[PDB]
Amino acid sequence: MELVLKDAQSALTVSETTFGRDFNEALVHQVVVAYAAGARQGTRAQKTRAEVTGSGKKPWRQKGTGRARSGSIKSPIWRSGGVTFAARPQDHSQKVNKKMYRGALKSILSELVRQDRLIVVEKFSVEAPKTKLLAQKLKDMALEDVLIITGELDENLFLAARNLHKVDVRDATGIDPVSLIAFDKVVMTADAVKQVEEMLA
């Protein structure tokens, strides 16, 4: 399989199993959903009837008063009472099998190629850490909302992209499934392509 470079006007040979496989939507959906579950903090609580502040005194005697029977001022039936099934902090993360994570990545990258959203370049860099330079470079290549995957994290490039909210810059080892789907285009350097190929076997 040949990926056509855009800045050098050549070709690059990649594995068909990484970049030319079918889209497994059911597999990609599970991995994307697990990624968002992994981002949850899960920090909350309410108070059960045991934790509401108050005394254990029976509000009134069992029989004779003509009122419904009461046992605790903290009953969840009562205003100011406990929460019946009060929440505790939770860990929402899911397990993803190693082979399912990698399988989903290969499905996503292959679909990016079919939809013409993967752009391979020989080099992508800026001379100075200036946002204005990267904005001009992206305007020249008709890009606006783009994920940029480099082999080595150029320090000038990373700084130049910080204040551009539609633009992200990563190294090949830091790609994630949600980012590959979320950006309009994905720009990879030839060097990053090899690293991703080797990473996904």
Partner RNA sequence: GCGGCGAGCGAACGGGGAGCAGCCCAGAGCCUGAAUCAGUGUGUGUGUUAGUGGAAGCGUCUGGAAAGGCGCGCGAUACAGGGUGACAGCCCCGUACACAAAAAUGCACAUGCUGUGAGCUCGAUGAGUAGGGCGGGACACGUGGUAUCCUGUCUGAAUAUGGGGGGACCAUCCUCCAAGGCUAAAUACUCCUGACUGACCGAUAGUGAACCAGUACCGUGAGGGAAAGGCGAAAAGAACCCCGGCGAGGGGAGUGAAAAAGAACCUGAAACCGUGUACGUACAAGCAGUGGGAGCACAGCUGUGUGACUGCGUACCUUUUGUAUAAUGGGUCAGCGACUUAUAUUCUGUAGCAAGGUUAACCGAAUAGGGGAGCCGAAGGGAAACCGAGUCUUAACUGG
Partner RNA sequence: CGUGACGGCGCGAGCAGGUGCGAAAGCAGGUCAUAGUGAUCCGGUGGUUCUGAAUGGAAGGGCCAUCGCUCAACGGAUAAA
**Pairing status of strand 2-4 against strand 11-13:** antiparallel
> Which of other proteins, RNA, K ion, none has residue 25 at its interface (CB below 5 to 8 Å by kind)?
other proteins
**Least distance CB 42 / other proteins (angstroms):** 13
Of residues 42-61, those binding other proteins (CB under 8 A):
none
Figure out which of the listed residues 13, 55, 62, 115 binds RNA, where binding follows CB under 7 A: 55
What's the gap between Cα 8 and its chain centre? 32
> Which of RNA, K ion, other proteins, none has residue 10 at its interface (CB below 5 to 8 Å by kind)?
none
CA gap 146, 119 in Å, rounded: 10
Contact 19, 113 (CB under 8 A): yes
What's the gap between Cα 164 and its chain centre? 19
- Nearest 10 degrees: Cα torsion 110, 114, 120, 125: -90
Of residues 95-134, those binding RNA (CB under 7 A):
95-103, 129-132
CA gap 181, 19 in Å, rounded: 15
Tokens linked to 9: 């006007």
**Under the criterion CB under 5 A, does residue 80 sit at the interface with K ion?**
yes
Coil, strand, or helix at residue 27?
helix
**Under the criterion CB under 8 A, does residue 111 sit at the interface with other proteins?**
yes
Nearer CB in complex with RNA: 12/159: 159
**Under the criterion CB under 8 A, does residue 181 sit at the interface with other proteins?**
yes
Residues that bind K ion (CB under 5 A): 53-54, 79-80, 161, 164, 167
- Which residues lie near other proteins (CB under 8 A)? 23, 25-26, 28-30, 32, 108, 111-112, 115, 178, 181-182
